[PDB]
């Protein structure tokens, strides 16, 4: 019996839902209260009766604020996660810095009075959009204990991610002209270790800014990935292996079976 399983058995509809089975509450971390990042919003399940939850930190991209990623916070948290959407120290911070700030945001959750008793501090993940996705890769590349990483239209000057030991879902936008997949997302997938649990999901017809408003394909497979690897929840492998056949996906490849 997997002690980290939360919520009822999933369906495609349940992972597409704008809100999952867990009611969510939120608390704000001010910039003055945030050591090593720019503040943020923490979304968490109020129901404690099934146990503690894994934690996820999400970074926006260059010049962007929390607003651009906020919709991910409650949508993911309501599936059974404590999720912090961050602001960065400055709007101009580059990817390695954003990765360090993602780690700082996770470290913050460990002692946050509102959520300390709701998180399993051993089970943590990182996500981000654009330079924030490069940040998520960098955070994993500097911390092999992270359980999942999800760069969304990630941008980074570093193309070699052989240091990453964290299961990673690389989400590309087919028509991205800012972080084009051929030189960013797909290059990242290809240099992640060949034996890592990993996947590349390309969003058909999508531009760079697909992640800045609700996108059901992004949410449903981000949720499945976090469930599968932050919770070791084998009930979600069905959505990842074999490749999704959604029309909204133009390309997909993975190191399935994860088991
Ligand atoms: Mg289908």
Author numbering: 2 to 260
Q: What text comes from the article?
A:
The recently discovered metagenomic-derived polyester hydrolase PHL7 is able to efficiently degrade amorphous polyethylene terephthalate (PET) in post-consumer plastic waste. PHL7 is a thermophilic polyester hydrolase isolated from a plant compost metagenome along with six homologs (PHL1-6). It rapidly hydrolyzes amorphous PET at 70 °C yielding terephthalic acid (TPA) and ethylene glycol (EG), outperforming all previously reported PET-hydrolytic enzymes, including engineered variants. All polyester hydrolases share an α/β-hydrolase structure with a canonical catalytic triad comprised of serine, histidine and aspartate.
We cocrystallized the inactive variant PHL7 S131A along with the PET hydrolysis product TPA. Addition of Ca2+ or Mg2+ improves the thermostability of PHL7 by up to 7 °C4. In a crystal structure of PHL7 that was obtained in the presence of 10 mM Mg2+ ions, we identified a magnesium-binding site comprised of E13, D246 and D247. The Mg2+ ion is complexed by the carboxyl sidechain of D246 and five water molecules in the first interaction shell forming an octahedral geometry. Three of the five water molecules in turn interact with the sidechains of E13, D246, and D247 while the other two are only coordinated by the divalent metal ion. This Mg2+-binding site of PHL7 resembles a Zn2+-binding site identified in the thermophilic homolog Cut190 (binding site 4), which was described as a site unrelated to PET-hydrolytic activity. In summary, two metal binding sites have been identified at the surface of PHL7. Similar to previous studies on other polyester hydrolases, these may as well serve as future mutagenesis targets to increase the thermal stability of PHL7. The two metal binding sites are 26 Å apart and may act independently and thus in an additive manner to increase protein stability.
